[PDB]
Structure 1
Amino acid sequence: MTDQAFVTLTTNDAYAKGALVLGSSLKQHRTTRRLVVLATPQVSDSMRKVLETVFDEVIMVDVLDSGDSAHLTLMKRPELGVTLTKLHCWSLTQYSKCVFMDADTLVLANIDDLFDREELSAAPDPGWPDCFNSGVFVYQPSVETYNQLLHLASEQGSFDGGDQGILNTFFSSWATTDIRKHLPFIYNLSSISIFSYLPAFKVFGASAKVVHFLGRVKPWNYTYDPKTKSVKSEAHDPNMTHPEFLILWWNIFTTNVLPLLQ
């Protein structure tokens, strides 16, 4: 109501375009909750103003960077040290409960029923499903938890160099303790860009509630032709096996977001 929020993060203007599409999609599906975006100083002044037209609030935060090149190299994503910035989401005690969503997500149906869930509720990671994917999660802001998380990050770091490792470590009961903290995979459908063959998608994909463009290739990295509605397909590319979501992203961007960027 005033008490609960969807929260996302952008540290630059590229992911900000993702944030804008996510925000638009939440509004399209008539959330009754607040929309908030955490932004760092690399987000341009002009992009912050655009974010303000979609989000109820833009909250400026400091970048938190693991600096963990060794574990980010294992992850194959040397840029993701800045995802520790996500931890600031726990500082938002103006809200009693929030859903964090990655800026590379897209909402396909109303998902306000997530606010029935308890901290920490998340869906399984598509590659290592004993860990939860940290791109969509239900949590409770808390100065206590925020401080504990910052401390763990500074003392031990993260096994993957980013937020997902440290969050899985801190919330390590997730895989075995309480099945009500497992979100269905359709609330974080995160395998499409990185798995070539997904037979389950063909029978269950139509029920997707949130699609998550997990992996190095983001929808905004494509060249989209709005005349024919084609994307230049980038060589071998699992997005093109099931391109409906990438197409949708660009539809929302071109129709609902591009006019705000004028």
Structure 2
Amino acid sequence: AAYATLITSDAYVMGVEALVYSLFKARVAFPLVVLHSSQVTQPTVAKLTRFCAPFQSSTWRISFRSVPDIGISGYTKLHIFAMDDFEQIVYIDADAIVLQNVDELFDRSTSFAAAPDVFPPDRFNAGVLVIRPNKQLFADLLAKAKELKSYDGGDTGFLNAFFPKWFESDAASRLPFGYNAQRTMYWLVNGKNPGYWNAVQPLKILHYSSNPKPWEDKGDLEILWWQMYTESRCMSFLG
């Protein structure tokens, strides 16, 4: 079993670094695979590898894997379904950070789990996925990628069209929102109804969905991201 993340542009390297360090800080008991697509330049890969080196130990491995871009690079994330050298993958977007150990996600008996999106709340968000790789399912995703329209023009819309009965699936396949707590809800509710956000307990993964990404541009959640990132740079370079 492994955690996996994805980088398809040099500009997201700071997101990966914050995520890597948040997993290190949470003492996760499974290795991490960083997928990087063709558009990520080799110097950025080398920089990322150097940043991760001080977090490597005999008890935690961070590995790197080249993957081809999957165009609509908008579908490159589908590569997690082909990683069948692993029985189970916990995939996390590079614009998320882990606040608490989430190793229990590997205890879910399902081939596919995701957390609900906020709009609408009976569809799922594709930023956190717990999957069991299967190369035949991967092939059919690739094939259907040229047929199924996506209501958000991205991988979330496409995956919901491919798994339209996710909402009806068992509890193992539907992650609580605390495993993919999207800052878009915080932005909307914090000023008037902050109690809606405080209801999300435990809050284990923060997802910095929508734009700009925190490294691209001072809300409370963005302060938290920079706290994680700057500590990561401090510990990687000085620790």
Please provide the CA RMSD for this pair. 2.1
Q: Which residue of 2 aligns with 1:6?
A: 3
| Structure 1: distance between partners of 2:105 and 2:199 | 20
C-alpha contact 2:8 2:37 (8 A) present in aligned 1 = yes
Cα drift, residue 32 of structure 1: 0.9
Identity of aligned residues (%): 36
| Structure 2: distance between partners of 1:200 and 1:177 | 29
Does 2:148 align with 1:151? no
| Structure 2: distance between partners of 1:255 and 1:162 | 32
SS in structure 2 at match of 1:59:
strand
Structure 2: gaps of 5 or more residues: 53-60
Written as runs of structure 1 = structure 2, the 5 A alignment for 1:73-88 is 82-88=73-79
Q: 2:227 aligns with which of 251, 258, 262?
A: 251
Does 2:137 align with 1:116? no
| Structure 1: distance between partners of 2:135 and 2:216 | 37
The amino acid of 1:22's aligned partner reads L
| Structure 1: distance between partners of 2:233 and 2:33 | 17
How high is the TM-score relative to the length of structure 2? 0.86
C-alpha contact 1:12 1:43 (8 A) present in aligned 2 = yes
Q: Which residue of 2 aligns with 1:79?
A: none
Q: 2:42 aligns with which of 34, 42, 45?
A: 45
Cα drift, residue 57 of structure 1: 1.6
How high is the TM-score relative to the length of structure 1? 0.79
| Structure 2: distance between partners of 1:176 and 1:16 | 36
Structure 1: gaps of 5 or more residues: 67-81, 223-232, 234-239
| Structure 2: distance between partners of 1:124 and 1:218 | 21
CA distances 1:191-235 after superposition (whole Å, capped 9, x unpaired) = 34542444344533563100001112211022xxxxxxxxxx4xx
Q: Which moved more, 1:52-61 or 1:173-182?
A: 52-61
C-alpha contact 2:19 2:96 (8 A) present in aligned 1 = yes
Q: Which residue of 2 aligns with 1:35?
A: 32
Q: Which residue of 1 aligns with 2:64?
A: 58
1:65–1:193 Cα change, 3 Å: farther
CA distances 1:120-167 after superposition (whole Å, capped 9, x unpaired) = 111100121111010001001111111011011023353432211121
